[model samples]
Target chain A: MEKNSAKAVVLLKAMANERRLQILCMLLDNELSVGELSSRLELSQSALSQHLAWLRRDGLVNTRKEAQTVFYTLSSTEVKAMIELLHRLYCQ
Target chain B: LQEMEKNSAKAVVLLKAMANERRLQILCMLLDNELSVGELSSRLELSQSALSQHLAWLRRDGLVNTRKEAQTVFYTLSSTEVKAMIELLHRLYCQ
Candidate 1:
C-alpha cells in the first residue's frame, strides 16, 4: 500500500509542473514532433525539450524517431486514462 | 483556448498538492469518508502538529473541507476535481 502510494507520487510529481502537465495533455491522443509541439504551445524548443525529458524519464511518454525529427506520444492506456480524467474533470 | 489553458493551470495546482507523499496519503485516507483530526493522526501515525501543517496546506489549496462535531474537527476532500483524481488514482494503482 505504501509502495503504491509512493508510485502515485512519482506520477503526480511528474505532472505537477504547468508546462509538463500541458505536454502530457497535448500528447494525450496525438503523436507530435518537437517542432510541432513548440509551435502549437508557443514554448521554446529547448524548454519543451527539457519538459519532454522529464516526461520520458518518468515513463509518462514514449518517443519515436523518423530520421531527423523525433515525435512523442502518451506511454500507455493507463496514462491516457489519467489524462482523460483530468480533461473530464477540468476542461469539460 | 485560453480557458483550457487556465484549466491546465488549475489542474497543475491540484497535482502539485498531490505530489507530496504525506499530503497524498492524507488525501487517500479522506477519499472514502471524512475523518476527525484525532482519528487522522492515529491512522497516519503522524503528530497532530505535523498533520495540522499538511492539513493547513490542503486547506489553503481548496482541496479539503472541515466541519465541527462537538469540538472535534473533521476533514474531507473539497475539490471535485481532486476527488475524481483520487478515484482514478485508486483505480489505477490501489486496485
Candidate 2:
C-alpha cells in the first residue's frame, strides 16, 4: 500500500507540471528528439530538459541516444492511456 | 495552441492537488464508495485533522463532493472524469 501511494505521488507530481504534461502528450503521438520537442512546445532547451528530467525521474519516459541527440518516448502503456484519457477529457 | 495551453493549465491544477501521497490514497478509496472523515482516517492511518485538510483541498478543487447526513459528512468523487482517472490510476499503480 505504501509503495502504491509512493508510485501515485511520483506519477502525479510528474503530471502536475504543464510543460511536462505537454511533453508527455506530444510523445504520446510520436517519439521526438529534444530539439523537436523544444521547437514544437516553444520551450527553451534548458526548460524542456528540466521537464524531461522530471518525467524520466518518475519513470514515465525513456530515451534513446542516436549520435548527438536523444529521442524520448513514453515508458509505460499506462501513462499513454492516462494521457489519452486526459486529452479526451480536457482537450476535446 | 493557446487553447491547449489553457487546457493544460487547468489539468495542472487538478494534478497538483493529487500530487500528495495521502490525498491520492484518499482519492483511490473514494473511487469505490463514499467515505467519512473517520473511516478515511482509520483506513489511511492519518490523523483526522490531516485527513480533513486534504479533504478540504479536494473540495476546494471541485474534485470531490460532500454530503452531511445526520452527524456524519460523506465524501465522494464529484465527476465522472475524476472517477475514471482514479480508476485508471488504481489499475496502473495499485494493482
Show model 1 residue runs off by greater than 4 Å.
none
Tell me the deviation in Å of residue B91 in model 1.
0.8
Which sections of candidate 2 miss by over 4 Å?
Answer: none
Give residue B72's error in model 1 in angstroms.
1.8
Docking class of 2: medium
B1-95 per-residue lDDT for model 2 (tens digits): 57778999998888998899888888899987999888999999999987888999999998899999998999999877788889888888775
* Cα shift from native, residue B54, model 1 (Å): 0.8
* All DockQ scores: 0.80, 0.78
RMSD in angstroms, all models? 1.3, 1.3
Q: Write the per-residue lDDT of candidate 1 for residues B43-72, one digit (tens) a residue.
A: 889999999999999999999999998989
Q: How close is chain A of candidate 1 to the true chain A, as a TM-score?
A: 0.94
